[PDB]
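Ligand: zinc ion. Inputs:
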Amino acid sequence: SSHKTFRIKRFLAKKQKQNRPIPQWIWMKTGNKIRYNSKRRHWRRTKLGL
Amino acid sequence: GAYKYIQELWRKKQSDVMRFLLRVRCWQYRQLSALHRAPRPTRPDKARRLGYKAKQGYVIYRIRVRRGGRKRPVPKGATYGKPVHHGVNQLKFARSLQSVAEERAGRHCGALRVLNSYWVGEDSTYKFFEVILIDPFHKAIRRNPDTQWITKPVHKHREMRGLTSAGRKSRGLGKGHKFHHTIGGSRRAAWRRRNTLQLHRYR
Amino acid sequence: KIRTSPTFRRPKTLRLRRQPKYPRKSAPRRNKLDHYAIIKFPLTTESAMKKIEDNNTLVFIVDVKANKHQIKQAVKKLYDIDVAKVNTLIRPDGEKKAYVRLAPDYDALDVANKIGII
Amino acid sequence: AKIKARDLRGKKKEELLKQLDDLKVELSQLRVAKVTGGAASKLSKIRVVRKSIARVLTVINQTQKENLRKFYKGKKYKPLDLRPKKTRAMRRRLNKHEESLKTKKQQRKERLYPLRKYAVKA
Amino acid sequence: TTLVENKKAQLVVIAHDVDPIELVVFLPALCRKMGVPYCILKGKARLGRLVHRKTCTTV
Amino acid sequence: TKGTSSFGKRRNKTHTLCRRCGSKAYHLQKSTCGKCGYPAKRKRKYNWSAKAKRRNTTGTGRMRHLKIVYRRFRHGFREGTTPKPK
Amino acid sequence: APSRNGMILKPHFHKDWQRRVATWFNQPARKIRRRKARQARARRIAPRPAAGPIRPIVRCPTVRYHTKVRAGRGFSLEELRVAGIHKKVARTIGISVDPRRRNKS
RNA sequence: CGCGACCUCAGAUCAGACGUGGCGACCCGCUGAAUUUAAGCAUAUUAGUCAGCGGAGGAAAAGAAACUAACCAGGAUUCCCUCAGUAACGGCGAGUGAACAGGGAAGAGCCCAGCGCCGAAUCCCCGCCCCGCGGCGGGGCGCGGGAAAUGUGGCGUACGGA
Ligand SMILES: [Mg+2]
Ligand SMILES: [Mg+2]
Ligand SMILES: [Mg+2]
Ligand SMILES: [Mg+2]
Ligand SMILES: [Mg+2]
Ligand SMILES: [Mg+2]
Ligand SMILES: [Mg+2]
Ligand SMILES: [Mg+2]
Ligand SMILES: [Mg+2]
Ligand SMILES: [Mg+2]
Ligand SMILES: [Mg+2]
Ligand SMILES: [Mg+2]
Ligand SMILES: [Mg+2]
Ligand SMILES: [Mg+2]
Ligand SMILES: [Mg+2]
Ligand SMILES: [Mg+2]
Ligand SMILES: [Mg+2]
Ligand SMILES: [Mg+2]
Ligand SMILES: [Mg+2]
Ligand SMILES: [Mg+2]
Ligand SMILES: [Mg+2]
Ligand SMILES: [Mg+2]
Ligand SMILES: [Mg+2]
Ligand SMILES: [Mg+2]
Ligand SMILES: [Mg+2]
Ligand SMILES: [Mg+2]
Ligand SMILES: [Zn+2]
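Predicted complex:
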């Protein structure tokens, strides 16, 4: 909604920042088990709660 | 000493003098609120023999308790179960009215500690008790060796765990053949000891 | 004396002022949102460049706690420039973008070269 | 160069503040370089500048509160921050004197009948 | 009361308005039987002004 | 009209996020939290849900003060002094 | 269901006996702890007897046991004053005292 | 009328303190079922148990007889073995069910009120001086202020005491 509140806007800001993929240089560490970000979220599939 | 004379006076409650005193005092207490500090004990001798001293740190609260039994807080009828549990009216509460009194007095005055309490009046619908309370942080108390026992953390909230005289009179504890069901800490401790299998390593 | 009203009302008593015998906390809290932590760094995007070249403004981003008065005071102290007005918006990323329009007698492009963004 | 908290203890509060201000100015310039796109050298040095900020502020705070404790050393009433922060129960606990002082009756009993040291033949 | 029942007292002054009356209600009869003269005086405040305290029931 | 066409009228929400536990269980007309009972002073907690007790308890969060308390208890709550200067 | 000749039994296992079963796997640990505490006490009281104060001769109460003697609680006040030890000095020199016990014979 | 005590009762962002909430394996106090068994079921059983509420500690609770006994008598409390699946309870059905004595672990006893006698001989706080200080205490000085006779302290408590 265009008529947001401040708490909700901060919440959306944090998850918008979280929704980025993984940097490539981490895939090259010594003890690395991570191959892709499994906590991704698409705006149409998963509806974020709220 | 006058304390003895006051003691027989208060043991002659059916006398016209004490009856007049009790009637007037009961009327005044009823007109007052339900939980208020008294300026000083109404029965100094009884307070002294219950452990009250005329020192800074001992306060007295006069409190009022509604009289009667206890009905089961179940909706209109409908005690859903077997007929042995359909009763709701003639039930009685395990603790005494004096215990309920000092319990709620100590709950309201949370930073003080309950010593004891005594009966000052009653009518058909209320009972009036005076409860002795001690401030465990006043230095005239903390510096006195014979009364700094109550400043220990273990004695916090005596009246709610049932360690004062009124609560003790209802836990069914005592010496001898009359009190077999409480050997050990309490009734629950006795039950726990009796209903427990001891499985030794070799049986 | 006499009572002309049938209502007893609580009499006006005397209320003393605090005369504390020791301060509650030892020292005043240090001002953490000061003129250096209040403005973080200026934007250097194409939109910001167009705004500084045309509207004679500057574009910064700040933390969400700053007022427009605080922002303009900080800009005045750090960059010794007079400020006409401030427009703020909380960006969807989370910071507070601030458009600071200068007094006409200063030049936004010159101030930008002085600061180092261009 | 390498600002370290051992040659900063002997200084005076005014040049402490001035040095802090200079370090803050340098940090602001470094952040400007970061956002505009700068050298890995500056991008690395921003951490050093931040830690210099941290240790200068630490020295200031430590000296200030140390002088403040020295000031409140003798007085009976002192701020809660300067009071000892042990656990709440330990602050509520009886103090060392009154947990030791005893009644005249039983100290008289102790002096009249002290506990003896004995042994029994086999 | 202990002086009166030892008959060591020569007269007893009792304040008239002790707020539990029971602390003194027995005292006139005891004083009579011991034969000690007693009087009832207005004001425990002014009676305890004799001593240097706020209040006193009997002197 | 019992299902699919009645699912379309769901457009205003009955719960929001609350200030104690941050879960989306704060009923708006009751103005209470269904998970912690926020307006009440005491935490909502029951013994018929061991899982619910485990989901948020003392060992779950950050232990910001309590782990420091542990580390200090291992030495006896020393104060005032510092290790011997070099 | 009952079967051919046998005994009819009454197991008291109809409560929830499994939520409270007291096992004894720590019995050796408890014995070791008790004896370590015993040794610590014995060597904190350096020259004094390990078993504590002396205790008096006692008959057992009932008819089943009234032919045997054992150790009592403490020495009574009457025998203590006959022997000439003081009430407050007996237990400071190592003599147990109990003021509750009579002396019939 | 006014002034002054005292008693009751208010108001303070008055000076200095204290409580709230969390965890909750163990503990203390209330409240408290129904599945189930009885080959049905209503008393009984499940069970003073689950769920519910309140309150602590490093353990808690209990505890120094208004006891057990009937002996040639034992002697605070708590725990273990036994007593004992016993005396007893029970549509005397299903089922339930202790205690004394005996052997061990541990071992520790004490204080008031009241009755009395000592010139309130008692306690708290403020200000000042010296000392100590991260458990705010020691000494001295205040014709400093209060509490207290509607009872503080010393002696003293059933084993008697003065
Ligand atoms: Mg959709
Ligand atoms: Mg009950
Ligand atoms: Mg009774
Ligand atoms: Mg005494
Ligand atoms: Mg609604
Ligand atoms: Mg709770
Ligand atoms: Mg068969
Ligand atoms: Mg204040
Ligand atoms: Mg019941
Ligand atoms: Mg059946
Ligand atoms: Mg069946
Ligand atoms: Mg059926
Ligand atoms: Mg039935
Ligand atoms: Mg039952
Ligand atoms: Mg439960
Ligand atoms: Mg609590
Ligand atoms: Mg604790
Ligand atoms: Mg205890
Ligand atoms: Mg106790
Ligand atoms: Mg006794
Ligand atoms: Mg026994
Ligand atoms: Mg057998
Ligand atoms: Mg049963
Ligand atoms: Mg036995
Ligand atoms: Mg032994
Ligand atoms: Mg006395
Ligand atoms: Zn919540």
